[PDB]
Amino acid sequence: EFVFKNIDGYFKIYSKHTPINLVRDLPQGFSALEPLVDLPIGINITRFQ
Amino acid sequence: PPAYTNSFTRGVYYPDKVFRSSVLHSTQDLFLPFFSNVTWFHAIHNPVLPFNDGVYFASTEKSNIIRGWIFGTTLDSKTQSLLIVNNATNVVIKVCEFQFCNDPFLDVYYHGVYSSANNCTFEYVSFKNLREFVFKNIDGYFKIYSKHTPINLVRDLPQGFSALEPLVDLPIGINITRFQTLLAAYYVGYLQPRTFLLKYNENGTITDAVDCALDPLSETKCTLKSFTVEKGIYQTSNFRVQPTESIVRFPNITNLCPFGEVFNATRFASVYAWNRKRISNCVADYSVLYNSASFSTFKCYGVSPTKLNDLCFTNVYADSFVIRGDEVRQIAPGQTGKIADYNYKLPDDFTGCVIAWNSNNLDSKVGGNYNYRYRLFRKSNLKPFERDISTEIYQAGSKPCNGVEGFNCYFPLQSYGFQPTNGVGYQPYRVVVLSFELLHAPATVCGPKKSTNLVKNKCVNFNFNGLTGTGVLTESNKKFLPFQQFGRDIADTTDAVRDPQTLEILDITPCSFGGVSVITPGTNTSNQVAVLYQGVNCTEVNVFQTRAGCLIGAEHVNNSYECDIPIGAGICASYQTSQSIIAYTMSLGAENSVAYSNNSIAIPTNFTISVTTEILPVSMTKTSVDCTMYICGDSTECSNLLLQYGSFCTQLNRALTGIAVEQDKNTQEVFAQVKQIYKTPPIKDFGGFNFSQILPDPSKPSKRSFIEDLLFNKVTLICAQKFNGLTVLPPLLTDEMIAQYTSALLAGTITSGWTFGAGAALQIPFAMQMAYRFNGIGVTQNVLYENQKLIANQFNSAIGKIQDSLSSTASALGKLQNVVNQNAQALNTLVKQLSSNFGAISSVLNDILSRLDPPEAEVQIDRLITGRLQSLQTYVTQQLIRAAEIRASANLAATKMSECVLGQSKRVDFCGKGYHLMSFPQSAPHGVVFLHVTYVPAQEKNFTTAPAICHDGKAHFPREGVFVSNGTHWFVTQRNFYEPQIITTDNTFVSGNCDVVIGIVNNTVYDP
Ligand SMILES: *[C@@H]1O[C@H](CO)[C@@H](O[C@@H]2O[C@H](CO)[C@@H](O)[C@H](O)[C@H]2NC(C)=O)[C@H](O)[C@H]1NC(C)=O
Ligand SMILES: *[C@@H]1O[C@H](CO)[C@@H](O)[C@H](O)[C@H]1NC(C)=O
Ligand SMILES: *[C@@H]1O[C@H](CO)[C@@H](O)[C@H](O)[C@H]1NC(C)=O
Ligand SMILES: *[C@@H]1O[C@H](CO)[C@@H](O)[C@H](O)[C@H]1NC(C)=O
Ligand SMILES: *[C@@H]1O[C@H](CO)[C@@H](O)[C@H](O)[C@H]1NC(C)=O
Ligand SMILES: *[C@@H]1O[C@H](CO)[C@@H](O)[C@H](O)[C@H]1NC(C)=O
Ligand SMILES: *[C@@H]1O[C@H](CO)[C@@H](O)[C@H](O)[C@H]1NC(C)=O
């Protein structure tokens, strides 16, 4: 997953890899996401595509 | 080689001319510290001594040789000099200036000098004896204090005290930092910002003064504002453990810091093709900038190079190119020209540094370089952040050009010639430019910031990646996730921090905190101290470490005794065992082990009848502090500004009057619960129960008996409160009427007893009243009817002990005394907040208005009056809570009088320790005193017991009082007094068979 946001001019991206074997839908469970890359770009971005 | 002696209690002077009587008013100013070294001087074979904060001078001049002084700061024939002459009993002072010689001195071989002057500004003329002259300059005024005391001793200073009254005021106004006397034993001292606790007598003479920070007892006295410090432990002040130096930590080195890689580039690009190497996400050591010996220029525009390392940049840049030598000075803001426009334009707000160095011996060729080209001319300045790689053909005229030179067709491309015959301005140079940007983004690049070293187990500051603070770092075993940097606690307080350099988990702990207690016995017994440093390990600060803290001055005692001065966590101190202060583990009473038995009892055969004394604060100082007068002193502006608060002013008085009326109510249901004021019979035939001590004495002016008089004398500051609007309203019940109600209640207790609480009083002899007040506690009346005289003996003995308790003990009336106190310093601090600035310029409204214009004075009194209103709100809330406590005690006293004076209370430990008998109210101001006559067994005897008796196979249990035996025969007696009965059917009832009863023994029952 790629979390996109400019909060207080600080662009954060989190990740969490879980090896599971199912394709039906999103898992019914709990997960925690820890940051990997943090570039405080601070750009006035309000839309994405 | 000056000798140093002890100054004793010398160096105390009247700080100001205000007169004070019988008050221990403490003060702090430039003073001579107690027990300080004194530099004794003599005239053998005359230097300049520092003035310091103050100067103390003393001398012993029987023949009056020491009479002169020369003071000053430079003495360069330009500054005025103090000059004191005492000739013909005349004091002469003048500040003229005269030239000095190599060794200026006064003709004094064995038994004056003055030349002309330059500038004179101030003119003024006025063993057996010890003359003292302190010298100081406060607010530009030079002050001299004198005291001549006739003594007969010359070897050293006397061991006593004497004040130093002043003589003259000298308003020189000139700063003085040096002095020098002119000439047989005289001393010199020095004044320091100390603090004393002065003591004025009845006539206003300072009889004794004590320093504050001399010893722990001195600090205790300074805090308490008293000389006689009783027993106990007193919290004086706090203590801090200062950080050692500092700890600053930041990431460093990282991978390579590859600035030298840019420096040692073999080839360089053209001037038009300057290359930007982005610098980010790397710790900048900035070590390359230090070696400036090889750099031709080192300057910065728009940034301070000194603060480059101390500040962090979000992003940084470095640019390198090669140009000619003479173009260095043209790289500056505010400069124009072809080079400044068509090549590189410097904005006026450029932030960076320009660095260049010689490269002619490495970047020059014999035949000339042909690699760096650019565009010579262009129509306008280059737009920002544009790469000028365009090679457009210059065409000044209107004639079109076909790419070949001709008519008005000039080729814009020209080549440079690098030759040895060229001048200095043709040399090739290396140029490197650094630009640092701070956009609207957080900083990403930080300097090393002197990572230094890291110290464990020693309190010190710390700065970890911008996390500052103070504490002590300790090794910890708390694991951290790789993305988690620093720890936390429940209260959002930092607990663990990991070192950025090494992934080691370090705790953070308070430095020391804790106050500074002072465990001292009363001056009645001893004079030694024992400082307890609350809850600190005995490592940063004879010494016996305790759970409660680090204890100093007392040795641990392996034996355990009764606690006398509680310390903390079970530790207790005492001076008795020469004898010295100790600190041991408290043992609550002698460790007893009552022999719990299968069938044995210890029923008392004798007893005692004490008369304890529990004092209950029933009423208090009825106060109704009017808001307007107290809060604002006689000011229309203050009245208008106070009216804004509105309901606070009008409701503070409502709350205080509610307090007053409820205190009168407390008094009403406490004393005035008797309908008719009964009076003592003229003849007191009580069967030996002497009552004259507590019954009112007709010979006395008021009907307050001896005990009440002693109480009133013991409790004590009378007309010093009702002075600032704190109108102490008189009680509705006059103190004489309070005495009347107490006497009525006590006389009803005598003649009517408990009955006068349920209607009119019903007469009963005092011998009959105790004849059933014993019966209340399960004690048969035969006790009194057989030992009434002895009962009277114990009663009168306890009454006699009451006077001793009042006189010899200052804590006998502790509760009432501290209640009257609490009120006294409550009103006192209420007064002092009139002096507190509360953030205003001063505490005088008139001074504020006179000093400044009303536009700002109004704001000043606004802040001051908000502070005063907050202070009054705090006082009234504290008064409400204290009056709630007083109301709880008043209902408790009413309950004790209803159940205990107007009855015989069955609640244990309510009317004293033991089986209660009766009580006597003895009013004391803002309170009441009870005389809890109780019953306490003393002497026991071990007997044998059994619940039941089977004579004819039928069990027999005692109605009241367990079965006992003296060894041969079995008897019945109540619990609280051994009195045997012959076991008969009258005192026993049959219930069940024998084999169902546990502990039953066979026995013989008499048959009436
Ligand atoms: C209980 O103790 C008291 C003392 O507190 C005893 O009173 C003593 O009585 C004898 C006569 O029997 C006198 O000679 C003594 O002078 C009394 N003592 C004092 C201090 O005056 C009392 O007798 C004891 N009662 C019993 C039953 O032992
Ligand atoms: C104060 O002066 C009076 C003089 O009438 C004297 O009687 C009294 O003893 C003095 N007070 C003290 C404490 O010496
Ligand atoms: C306090 O001082 C008085 C004065 O002599 C003395 O009688 C008394 O014993 C002292 N207090 C104690 C507890 O020793
Ligand atoms: C005081 O510090 C030492 C280490 O210097 C430690 O062993 C001891 O347990 C500490 N004292 C207390 C009461 O924790
Ligand atoms: C009661 O005590 C007072 C003083 O304590 C004494 O003057 C009086 O004579 C005593 N009365 C009796 C009856 O003992
Ligand atoms: C009873 O007390 C006496 C005197 O102290 C003692 O000698 C005896 O052993 C005790 N008996 C019991 C059963 O405790
Ligand atoms: C117990 O009291 C009785 C009373 O008559 C007496 O005869 C007997 O000797 C007493 N025994 C002891 C051990 O006191």
Ligand SMILES: *[C@@H]1O[C@H](CO)[C@@H](O)[C@H](O)[C@H]1NC(C)=O
């Ligand atoms: C306690 O006394 C009873 C008396 O009947 C006896 O039966 C029992 O054995 C005794 N127990 C002990 C532990 O002495």
Ligand SMILES: *[C@@H]1O[C@H](CO)[C@@H](O)[C@H](O)[C@H]1NC(C)=O
């Ligand atoms: C008590 O006396 C009865 C006689 O009726 C006897 O049966 C019983 O055993 C006795 N018990 C004890 C403990 O002596």
